[PDB]
Structure formats: C-alpha cells, structure tokens
Amino acid sequence: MDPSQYASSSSWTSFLKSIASFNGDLSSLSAPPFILSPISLTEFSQYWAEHPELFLEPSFINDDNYKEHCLIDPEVESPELARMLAVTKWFISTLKSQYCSRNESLGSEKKPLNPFLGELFVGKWENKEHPEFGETVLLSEQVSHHPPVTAFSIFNDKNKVKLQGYNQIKASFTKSLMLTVKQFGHTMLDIKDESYLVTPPPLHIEGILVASPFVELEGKSYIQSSTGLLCVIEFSGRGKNSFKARIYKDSKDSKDKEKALYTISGQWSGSSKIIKASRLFYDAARIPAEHLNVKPLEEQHPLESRKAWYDVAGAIKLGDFNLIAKTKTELEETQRELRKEEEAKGISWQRRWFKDFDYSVTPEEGALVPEKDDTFLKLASALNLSTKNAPSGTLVGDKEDLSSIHWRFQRELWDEEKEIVL
Numbered sequence: 001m002d003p004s005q006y007a008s009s010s011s012w013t014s015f016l017k018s019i020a021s022f023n024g025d026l027s028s029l030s031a032p033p034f035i036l037s038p039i040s041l042t043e044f045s046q047y048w049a050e051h052p053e054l055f056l057e058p059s060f061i062n063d064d065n066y067k068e069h070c071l072i073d074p075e076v077e078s079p080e081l082a083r084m085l086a087v088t089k090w091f092i093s094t095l096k097s098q099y100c101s102r103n104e105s106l107g108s109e110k111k112p113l114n115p116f117l118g119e120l121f122v123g124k125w126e127n128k129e130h131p132e133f134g135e136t137v138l139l140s141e142q143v144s145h146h147p148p149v150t151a152f153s154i155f156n157d158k159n160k161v162k163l164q165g166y167n168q169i170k171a172s173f174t175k176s177l178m179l180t181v182k183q184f185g186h187t188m189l190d191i192k193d194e195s196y197l198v199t200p201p202p203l204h205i206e207g208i209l210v211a212s213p214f215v216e217l218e219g220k221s222y223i224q225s226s227t228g229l230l231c232v233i234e235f236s237g238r239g240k241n242s243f244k245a246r247i248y249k250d251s252k253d254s255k256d257k258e259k260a261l262y263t264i265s266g267q268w269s270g271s272s273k274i275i276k277a278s279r280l281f282y283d284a285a286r287i288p289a290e291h292l293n294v295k296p297l298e299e300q301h302p303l304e305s306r307k308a309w310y311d312v313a314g315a316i317k318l319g320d321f322n323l324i325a326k327t328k329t330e331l332e333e334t335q336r337e338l339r340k341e342e343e344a345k346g347i348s349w350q351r352r353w354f355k356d357f358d359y360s361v362t363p364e365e366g367a368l369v370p371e372k373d374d375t376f377l378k379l380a381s382a383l384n385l386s387t388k389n390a391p392s393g394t395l396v397g398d399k400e401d402l403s404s405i406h407w408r409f410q411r412e413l414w415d416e417e418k419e420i421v422l
C-alpha cells in the first residue's frame with residue numbers, strides 16, 4: 001500500500017473511529033501495521049547527543065580561550081555566556097534528532113514499540129576522528145512501564161561532561177483528532193563543575209486525518225545554568241519547526257524580553273540566526289547526525305532493546321498482522337522467563353542504574369531523598385521551577401503546581417553492572 005492510499009483505507013478509518021473511545025493509554029492504540037515503528041522508545045535517549053562535537057564543546061571553553069569559542073560573538077562578555085551559547089546550540093541541535101528522525105527514516109512519525117520494564121539500550125559514540133573527544137557512552141533504561149518512563153545518562157569521562165534525565169508523557173486527543181502531548185521530566189548537564197537544567201517542551205501531532213503524522217513543538221523550554229544565566233526557548237509552527245530563544249543574565253530579567261543579552265530565531269530543523277543586545281547560529285541541514293555505535297545483535301544481552309524486539313521488528317517490516325501479534329506474545333513470554341532468571345541470579349532488573357528519589361516534603365521513612373546541595377533543587381530554585389511531577393517547565397504557582405518522584409543515575413551501579421557491556 002502506497003502512503004497516498006493510507007487516509008482512505010479501511011484500516012485508517014477504523015483507526016480514527018477507535019480514537020473516539022481512546023482509553024488514555026497510547027500503547028493500546030490499534031494502529032494499522034503501515035503506521036507502526038520498529039523502534040522502541042528506550043532508543044530515543046540517543047537523540048540527546050547525535051552531534052558529539054556540540055555535546056562536548058562547552059567543556060573546551062575556559063578563561064584562557066573563550067573568545068576563540070564563540071563563533072557568533074568574538075567579544076562575548078565572559079566564558080560563562082560563551083558556554084551558555086554553546087549549550088543552547090547543542091540543545092537546538094538535538095531537536096531534529098528528537099522530533100524528525102522517523103520522518104526521514106520511515107516517512108512519517110509512526111507508533112513506537114512500548115518498551116518492557118527493565119528494557120535496556122546502550123551504545124557509544126567512539127569519536128574516532130577526534131582523539132581529544134574520547135568515547136561518550138549512552139545508558140538508557142525503561143524504569144517504569146505503568147506509566148511508561150525512560151531514564152538515561154550520556155557521559156564523557158575524558159572531558160567530564162555528563163548528562164542524565166528521564167522522560168514520561170501524558171496525551172489526549174482533541175476533537176479535531178489532534179494528539180496533544182505534555183512531556184514530564186527534566187535533564188541535567190554537568191560540564192566539569194558547572195551545571196545546566198533543561199526542560200523538554202509540550203508538543204502536538206498533526207497530519208493524523210491524512211495519515212501522515214508529524215510532531216510540531218509549542219510552549220517553552222528552559223535552560224537554567226548554575227552560573228545564573230537562563231535561556232528561554234519558545235516554539236511555534238509556521239508556513240515550520242520555528243523558535244525564538246532569548247538568553248538573560250538571570251531569571252528575574254526573563255520577565256522582560258528587552259533585557260535579552262541575545263536573541264535567536266529561525267527553524268530548529270533548518271537555520272536560525274542570532275542578534276546581540278545578525279549572524280548564522282545553527283544550520284541543521286549542514287550538520288549530519290552521527291549515530292551511536294551499538295554492538296552487533298549476536299553479541300547483545302537479551303534485555304537489550306534491539307535484541308529483545310528483533311522478531312517483532314521483522315514482522316512490522318513485513319506488515320504481517322498475524323505475525324506481529326504472534327511475535328509480541330512470544331516476546332512477552334521470553335521477558336517474563338528472562339526476569340525469573342535475573343531474579344534467580346540475584347540480579348536487580350528493576351531499578352538497575354537509576355533510582356527514584358523522593359523530593360516531596362513527606363518522604364517515606366526509608367526513602368531515597370536529595371542530599372543538601374542537590375543540583376536539581378538549586379537550579380529549580382534559580383528558575384522558580386516547580387519540583388513536583390508537573391508537566392516539564394511548570395513554574396512554582398502555576399495551576400499544575402501531587403508527587404515529586406525523580407529518577408537519578410547512579411554511576412556505581414553501572415561500574416558494578418553484572419551483565420551488560422558496551
């Protein structure tokens with residue numbers, strides 16, 4: 001079936017009709033095979049660093065070289081601002097990865113595989129052509145299934161750049177059959193001793209009537225630094241993927257747009273320019289994604305995503321209804337059986353590399369809680385960001401601002417990991 005036959009197929013009409021009775025759980029969407037992705041959501045974590053050089057760039061900016069690492073402003077006022085510029089550029093560079101990859105590789109957004117609890121995805125950017133980079137490692141874990149929650153860490157030891165975060169969504173259909181999505185979660189980025197707090201934006205999926213789904217971003221993302229500096233990024237559709245970002249000396253100033261130290265505008269999936277107090281800031285079309293190195297299937301542990309979903313992926317690619325349904329049930333029995341074995345060997349398969357910390361004022365007696373100087377508390381306080389499980393970017397005293405549970409990477413658990421290698 002050619003894609004121009006999709007919107008009026010029986011399958012698609014049947015799909016749309018069942019939206020009317022949508023039960024609130026996206027995984028139960030009865031999507032036709034042609035709209036299915038063979039990729040699991042635990043793989044989406046790789047999309048935070050597909051431009052390794054931009055990921056690592058802030059670690060190379062110091063007091064003695066900063067004017068030489070600010071292409072759009074050679075008289076940038078400080079290394080702190082030069083690094084905030086660089087973090088903003090990196091963040092803008094992830095968006096195309098995050099939100100357009102299925103478009104390019106599959107032809108539209110397609111329904112992802114709902115990962116099983118304890119599913120794992122790992123790989124590395126080896127950065128062989130730039131020895132000063134060193135290897136950057138991605139760990140990604142399905143820390144919850146009901147609701148689905150993915151947690152991840154991307155880390156470069158050589159340059160002391162690490163990122164961690166987690167992601168969850170809530171979604172509902174509007175009466176025009178547009179799917180509105182709010183993201184939940186945040187990501188933190190340490191560049192040596194300096195820290196950055198990033199909130200993903202709300203989004204909507206369009207082109208559903210026409211059976212050509214695509215993501216458009218809306219609302220705002222924040223990037224708050226331990227330096228006090230704050231970038232606010234506002235998205236809209238257009239003609240697409242446009243935005244306007246502003247960087248402020250601090251979060252009090254962000255209340256007044258004319259206080260912006262710089263202003264960036266354009267398309268995150270194309271080009272954008274910047275003005276101070278214009279030049280090319282980022283051109284997504286000039287800078288190809290670099291895909292992480294994943295180990296061969298034959299060498300994968302059966303918890304690992306591509307190994308786990310192999311037969312399911314093969315059946316989706318064939319578009320075979322029966323075979324998909326059958327491979328899915330065998331996957332479920334394999335994973336149940338796999339967990340039993342983890343358990344017999346004394347292996348914790350559930351909170352494997354990340355733990356759920358309780359930031360509420362009423363933790364349970366033995367619960368994991370934040371230590372005094374916690375990076376998240378200090379950056380959320382700088383931004384006036386709610387520390388509860390509200391939609392990402394929710395500010396203190398917003399309507400949405402309920403638990404305060406956050407996933408945090410524990411490096412030691414990966415250093416003493418019992419099975420999984422890179």
Ligand SMILES: C[C@@H](CI)CCC(=O)[C@@H](C)[C@H]1C(=O)C[C@H]2[C@@H]3CC=C4C[C@@H](O)CC[C@]4(C)[C@H]3CC[C@]12C
Pocket residue numbers: 026029035044045047098099109110111112167169179181183205208213215
């Ligand atoms: C194909 C659709 C037809 I109506 C079915 C709806 C789904 O497939 C939803 C669940 C799916 C998509 O439409 C886009 C997906 C988001 C795309 C990118 C991100 C970025 C990443 O960092 C975290 C995951 C997230 C939010 C995806 C979640 C699942 C979405 C909404």
